[PDB]
Symmetry: C2
Amino acid sequence: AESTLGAAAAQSGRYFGTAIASGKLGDSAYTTIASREFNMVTAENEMKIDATEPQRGQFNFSAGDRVYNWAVQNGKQVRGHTLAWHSQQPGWMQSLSGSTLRQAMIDHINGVMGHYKGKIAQWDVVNEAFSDDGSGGRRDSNLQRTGNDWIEVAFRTARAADPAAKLCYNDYNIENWTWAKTQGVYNMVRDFKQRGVPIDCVGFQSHFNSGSPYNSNFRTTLQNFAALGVDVAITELDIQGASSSTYAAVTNDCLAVSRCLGITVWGVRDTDSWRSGDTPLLFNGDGSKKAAYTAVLNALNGGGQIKGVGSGRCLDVPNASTTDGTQVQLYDCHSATNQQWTYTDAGELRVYGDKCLDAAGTGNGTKVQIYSCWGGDNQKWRLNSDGSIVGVQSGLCLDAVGGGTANGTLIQLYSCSNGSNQRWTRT
Amino acid sequence: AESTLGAAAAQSGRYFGTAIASGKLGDSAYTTIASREFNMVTAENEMKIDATEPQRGQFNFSAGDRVYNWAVQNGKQVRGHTLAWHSQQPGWMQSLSGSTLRQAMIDHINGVMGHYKGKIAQWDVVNEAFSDDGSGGRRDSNLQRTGNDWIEVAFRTARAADPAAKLCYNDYNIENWTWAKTQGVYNMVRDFKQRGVPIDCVGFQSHFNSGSPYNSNFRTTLQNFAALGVDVAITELDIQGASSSTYAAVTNDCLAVSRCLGITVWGVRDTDSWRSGDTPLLFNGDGSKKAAYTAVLNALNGGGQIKGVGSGRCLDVPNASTTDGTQVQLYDCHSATNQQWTYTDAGELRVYGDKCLDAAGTGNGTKVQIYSCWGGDNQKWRLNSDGSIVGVQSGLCLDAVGGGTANGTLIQLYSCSNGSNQRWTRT
């Protein structure tokens, strides 16, 4: 299929997943989207060390199993997250070191993987072991202090516990090839593969924002790692601002690499995000598809003026008016500024640089006009591959009033119908 | 003093006020902004009918007085809101009709005004009496059903209760001259003035959004009413999206009409707004001045490339790259898209049409770069009259590193100090 992210990824043998919080499994708006769009699930916190072994030797899999069962029952594979980590260790584990800690780490791995043996597709065996200090060296943690070979030991232990699972090393800020951290990790995987240490994949968290932005050399990093013989996976993707171009770029980078298994966005709706303030996901709080959703789906499915298919006329701001509240119309196409629209990464259709195509409401018959740009959802649009233009807030289509084709025919929001007065062609 | 909204408005004999909610007076973030910027206060809910006369004949002024006391302790005047209205009537009053309702209306006016006799600058005597149906006629309410003269009676009653107060009729959607509602109200005021009914002002709520956008003909509406011999006031100003241009325009309309007493914005911070989702105010949830704050301030005080005054060099995007994360620098001025910056209504500095000047942080030394435009506060800037450019989120100034005047000097955020390397001029 090609209507949902998971189905469209499946076409090239990949998956499109999300992080699931068991706390939201009761929320129907949440499960409706999650069940429909994704085919891979990562438990947000449920499979962490603190959650699965609250007390030494005493394993708890209630929350983890809840997420796991939901996933399998809804046709999704699962990524285990995570076995050894310097962060979120239960207090009992923080009170350990040396041989005792090393042993605890091993017991925890066997305990968790044993419970889930044969039913987890990929495991993030070791998470965030490298430093951010620009050294490209490991981070000083109680685990690292037990011995530099702990990472190798963890992977060897993991392989033994469940040989059916793909074992990955997971980390953030290893996306830009030029970074000292990316090099540090690369060198470790290189070494591991040379010495036969069991590592099947490298997960790239992909938490992009203005502090650590996406760079096109990400495709290069993915290709260099894949050239070592490991699979690569985009594991916790979210982009500050949810730029349509950046989401499409990351998606195409995965598609360009045969060893890229798939992509997992870190959450369902912006409000579910650990960084909701950055509106970094594909669905907004209302559960509606953002402009980025369409950019991602179109990328997975394969690879100026706005002219009405039914009329052969262009979207025009009457007499080149700049006043807010001016309703747009159809008019003979001509090379004028009032007929030139720019679709931004935020999902706006700008004219005159700072005026936005705006919906004055959410119902059928709603007037489509220009108004100062401010980032409201009523000024965000989705340009579908079928030629329809859907408002993000309303979910309705741009519609030439009454099917009119003459100059002066007005534009409104209306139930999408695949009609020609709802079909547009960017030129 | 031209540094605060109130003091700046006072330079033209006007005031700049806000709506104060008593429940927020214990929040110093809230009161710090409120006591500093405004010189006129309207109680948001505390002087309403239900709040002041909970039971028939039993007046309660505890809440209203908390708003009043604060206002006078902090040197502000007060607008009373509101004495007669079809909305938010206490239960006992909603049950009344005919002459019984009519007398209760009179009793309420005498009761509230008597308590605040001589302490209130203006009173919104009757509020929202006109219909939105397009007839330009009266709204059907229990009050209007007591007889058409109820408005006249409310004014005659109020004048006798406190002859020291300016008595206003207050309504919304009466800003655009062309609307039936506006002209319906104009005719009522004209009738009153010619029959000697005591009315001193008309309050235009001015709640502007895309369904009811600001229109430049607002200035003729204001002039039309002032010509009737009544003072005019903008009473509950808020603009969906808080466009700098629209906010400056409304401000200039009041400044152009000598009988325009002042402007009251409906709330302090965006999160204090009854329409917070529209981010319609002058301070964001953090208590930071938005781009619109600057536009209003500049308008009250009398009111391409970006050259650093200290270097005589332009803000430049290295090699004309469009990669997120590219830090900006100073460079010999010249016509190049990578030197052309567009300041938008939202407060962004766009380059290449969809890249925005971006602060990757809030502290001193923070790097200033370009990043896909998305609307974050770290991409919002205030262009002050003194030549500085302040980041909305950080409160820091664009600072040419080390005072560097040479090509290649990097731009960073740093504490404002009005040095030459922090003053910029546009072209």
